[PDB]
Design a protein around this nucleic acid. Sequence first.
RNA 1: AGGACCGAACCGACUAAUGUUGAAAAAUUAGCGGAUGACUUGUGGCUGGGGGUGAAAGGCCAAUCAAACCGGGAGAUAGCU
RNA 2: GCUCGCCGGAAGACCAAGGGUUCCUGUCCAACGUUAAUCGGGGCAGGGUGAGUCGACCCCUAAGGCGAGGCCGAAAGGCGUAGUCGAUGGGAAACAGGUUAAUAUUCCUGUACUUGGUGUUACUGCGAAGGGGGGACGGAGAAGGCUAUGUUGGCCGGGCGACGGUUGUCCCGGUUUAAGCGUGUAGGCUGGUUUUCCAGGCAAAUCCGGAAAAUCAAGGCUGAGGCGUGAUGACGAGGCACUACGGUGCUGAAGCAACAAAUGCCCUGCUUCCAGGAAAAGCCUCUAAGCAUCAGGUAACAUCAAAUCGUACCCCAAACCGACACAGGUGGUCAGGUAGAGAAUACCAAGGCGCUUGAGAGAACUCGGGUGAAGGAACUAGGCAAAAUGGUGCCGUAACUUCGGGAGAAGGCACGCUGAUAUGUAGGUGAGGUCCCUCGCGGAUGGAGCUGAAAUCAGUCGAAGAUACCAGCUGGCUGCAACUGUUUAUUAAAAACACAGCACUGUGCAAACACGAAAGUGGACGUAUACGGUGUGACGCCUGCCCGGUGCCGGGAGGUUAAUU
Lengths: 271, 93, 46
Amino acid sequence: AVVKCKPTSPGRRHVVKVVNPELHKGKPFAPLLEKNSKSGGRNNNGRITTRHIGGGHKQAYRIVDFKRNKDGIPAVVERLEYDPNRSANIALVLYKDGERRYILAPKGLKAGDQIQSGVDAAIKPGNTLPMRNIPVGSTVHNVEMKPGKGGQLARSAGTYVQIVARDGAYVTLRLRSGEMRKVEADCRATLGEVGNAEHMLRVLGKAGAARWRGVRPTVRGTAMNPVDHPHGGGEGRNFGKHPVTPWGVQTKGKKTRSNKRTDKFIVRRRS
Amino acid sequence: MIREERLLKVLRAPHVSEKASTAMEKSNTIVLKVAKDATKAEIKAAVQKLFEVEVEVVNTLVVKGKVKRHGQRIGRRSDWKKAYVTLKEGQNL
Amino acid sequence: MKRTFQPSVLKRNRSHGFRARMATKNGRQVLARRRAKGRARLTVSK
RNA sequence: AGGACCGAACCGACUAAUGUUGAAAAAUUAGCGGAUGACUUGUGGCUGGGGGUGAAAGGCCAAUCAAACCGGGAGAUAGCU
RNA sequence: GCUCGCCGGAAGACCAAGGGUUCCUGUCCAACGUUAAUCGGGGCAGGGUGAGUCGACCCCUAAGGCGAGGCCGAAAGGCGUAGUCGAUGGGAAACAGGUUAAUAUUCCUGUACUUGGUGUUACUGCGAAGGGGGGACGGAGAAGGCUAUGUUGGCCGGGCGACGGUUGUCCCGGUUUAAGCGUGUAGGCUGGUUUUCCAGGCAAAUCCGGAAAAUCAAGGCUGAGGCGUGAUGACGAGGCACUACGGUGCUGAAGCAACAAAUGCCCUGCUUCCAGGAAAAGCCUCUAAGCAUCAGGUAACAUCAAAUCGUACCCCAAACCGACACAGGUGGUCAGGUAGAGAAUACCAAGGCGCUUGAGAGAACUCGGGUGAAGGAACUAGGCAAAAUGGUGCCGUAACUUCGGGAGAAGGCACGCUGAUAUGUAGGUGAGGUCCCUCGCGGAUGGAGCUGAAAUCAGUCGAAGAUACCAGCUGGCUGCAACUGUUUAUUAAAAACACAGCACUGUGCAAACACGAAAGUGGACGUAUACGGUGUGACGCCUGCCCGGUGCCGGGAGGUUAAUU
C-alpha cells in the first residue's frame, strides 16, 4: 500500500512511501547471500566513470534465479521478501526435492502458490517455459535474449513484455520501451508481470532519502565555470549554449545507438 | 636444545648492580649478559652445564643502547640481552 | 592549528620505504641516483 | 515517528573587541549555528598535474593552484630596468 | 615545614598514535632555560624495561595491493586467473595482594586457567583444501532486573575540644576483599523424541534440506546478578619496638545491614521501522580418498612444552604536529561528595597545580571589568557594542495556515524558611511471623524497618526566595530562497550550490555514457517503474504566441561532391 506521511516536520510533508505487509520481516535466507562491494562509481583505475554514486546503505546480494531451468520439479512459494538490489520483490521458493531458490516475484503471486518451469509447465503466473510454447498475445517478464543465458528483459517492478507474433524460429516482442524486437523462440520467458507496480508512486520527500539509496548531488553545468563544463559560467544567469554533455556532445536529440550487429533484431524503434 | 660449542658462547658476563645483588640475596637469582641471539633454553642449559647448578626459570630482556651526541655527530652503544637466571632453592655458586 | 605533517610509521614506510622504491622501475632509479650521490640514508629505515 | 524542538560533549564559524615586529604565518575572549543525521570521528585504502576531486567557491590536491612539487632542456628569451 | 590560592567530565588518572632514554640516582652549571639558578626534560657517569594466559608475531579474512601461466600494449609497461599478502574487524588461557630509587596482570606470595606433545588406563569409527551448521552482523525505541558506586544506620577504634555549649539524638575515621570453582536465578529463544522414504547440498553422508507416520507433553539452548566457595588468607585505623628521622620491623579492631542507583551488565536481547544492515578461519557436525587388531577419536591421572620481539618515560602534552619549555592541533578509556534535568554550572574530595623575570609606584593613554544623577537611540551608514530577557508549575495566548503549525506567541500568578494535616504524607522498597509447595536463588500471606516527592492550612525573616553560577528579549510590515543541509581552509555563508518534485532527451543490454592506443573495468552482478545527460527547483493557481535566424530531428528525387578507375 502507498501511504502519505503527516507533516510533523518539513522533510516529512511530501514523503509518500510504498508499504507492503506481504513482505517477510527481518532476515533473508542466508545460503543465497553474497557480498556486495560498493563502488562509488569508480572503475579499476580508481576514476569516477559514472557520477553521482556514493554512500547510502550497505547491502547484501541475493542470488536470484533468472534462468528458471530446474525443469519438471514443482515448487511452492514460501514468502515474498524485500531485495535491496532491485525495485521488484523476490519470492523464496521451495522445490519438491528440498532445494530453495529466489525468483522475481510476479504480480499476484503469494505464499502457497505453486510454480514450475519446463517445456510443459502450465500456463499460469510465475511459470517459465520457452516462448515457442507460450500463446501469442500473452504477457511475460524476465525474458531471455539468448536460450539458457538467463532473463534480461522486463525485470524492474511493474514491467512486462507482450508476445505479439511468432514465426519461424523467432518471436516478436513488444518491449516495455515500446520497441518491437525479434528474439529467438527457444528463449525462456515467465508468465505474468513483475510485481510491485505501485513502486513508481513513491515520493522520496527529502534529499536524505536519495542519499540513503546512494545518489549523490547533481551539479548543473550552467552553475559551473567554463573550464569545468561547456555550459560555461557567465555573469549572473547566462546560457546561450547549445546544450551539451560535460564532454561537448549534443545532449537533447542526438541519437547515440550505434550497433550494426544487432540492428536486424529491431522490428520498430521506440517512439 | 644444546651443542657444547654453542653453549660456551652464550654467556658473556656477570652484570653487577644493586638490583642484581638484591636479586641474588632475596631470590637466588643471578643476572647475566648473554648472547644477543640466545634463547631461554640455551641460557638455562649453558648455566646448568658450565656453572654446574640447577636452574628453575630464565627471564630475559633486551637493553636498548644509549645514544651520545658529539657536536654534530651521534654515537650509539650496542643493544644487549639481559638474563635473570633463577637458581633452585638449594643455592650454590 | 592542525599542521600538514601527521606522522604514521606504517604509512611512511609504505609510501617511501625501501621496498616501495624497489617495487617500480622509477623507484629503483630514486635509489640509483641516491647511491651515486653517495647518500648515507637510502630511505628512512628502522 | 521525525534531514522535529531546547541544550553540553562533538562538528561548525554569523557579530564585535583584542591581537597585527601576535601567545598564534588565521588565533583569543564574549556572544553565535548544527547537535539521530545529506551527522561526526579513528585506522588503512583508492583517484596524480591539462590530471584528480569538487552539494560548483576556479574551491582543494602538504602554510601563495586560472594548471602542484622536484630534477632536467637551462646560461629559455628579455628591442626592458 | 606551616599557611593562602587555582583545576577537579580536569589543569586528575590510563591507553593508542607519535617520540626515543626525556625514566631513576649521583655529580656538575659554561652553553641551553626569555631573569638568578645550588634547580631542570641541560652536561657527564652509572643504573633501570623480567610474561604460556597484556600486546605483537601467529591462524583468518575486508577495502585494496601484488600476481606463476595468461590477455593486452612501439619499448617501458597496463590489466588479471590460480594464488599470495593486507586490520582499522574474527580466533585459546590470570587474577588479588606484596615488593624496587626506577618494572610488574611480567618479580614474589596466594589461588587459577588454556592449548599441544608424551605415557598409562578404560571405552570407541577415525579420516578434508570438500558438504552443512556456526561464527554472522542495521537504525530507532521501550523498561524491567541488576551490578559499579553513593547515602544513612549499625559495628569497631579514637575523641571530650585555644572562646559561650559539647558523656550525647555528640565529633572524626574505617567498615575493603579478585580471577577461578560450585549453584543455573530475573529473564530471552525454541516444542521434543523415534522410525521410514527422497530429482537438492559439484562424489559421499549417519549431517543439512524435503516428505510421511508414531508418540509424549516437558525437553533443550542462552543467561546478568545474587549466594556459597576462593579466604585457616590478603587488605585494614591504630598500637608497640627501633631508626642515620628518609624510614624499617612486629602486631592488628570492626569489616554488617537497609535504601538509593547508572550512559556499565542481562541485551548479538525484546518491540518496531525501512534505508533491509562484511568476509574467512577457529569451533561443532557429515562423510570422500583412504586406514582397518594399526592409526586415530573421547576421558581421567601423570608428565613435558608454550619460543621470539615489545614492556622504561611523555602522552589532549615543556617529551607528539606546530622553527620556541609556543594561549593553537591531537583518537579511545575512567566518572567520587553537595546543589542540579544534566557529562551544563558553582563549590569541594582523590590527585595535580600557582602557568621560569621579579620589586615598587598608583600620571596620561591603551586593554579587560564594576557602579552611575537627569534624559533614554537624541549615537551611528546601522541600536555596532552594551544594557535587557532568562527556571519550573499552573492559568492564558491573535492574524495566518499546507491543519503539523504559528506557540515558550503575547501576558499573568506562585516560588524561602518553620509547624500542622502526617513527631515522614501519596508512592517506592520490603524483614520477622504463618501457611503451602512439583522444596527452591520458590509461591502466597504479612506488614516491621528503611526511603520519600508534592499539596493545602497556619506562622515567620529580608528591600529582594527561579536570590549565586547558570539561564529565551518581545511584537508589527516587507524583499529573497520552500524547507534540514552545502560553499570561497586563510577578508564573501548569501538571494549563491544542493534538495525532494517536474520536464526534455538519449539508452534493448556486449545499453547509452565514462576511464583506458588495448586488454580490462565502472554503468550493474542493474534491464525502460532501469541507467546517463540537460534544464527547472517544495507546494498552490498556472505555464500563451513565434520554426524567419542558430541548433537539432526526419527525407529522398535533383544539383554539386573524395579516394578510386
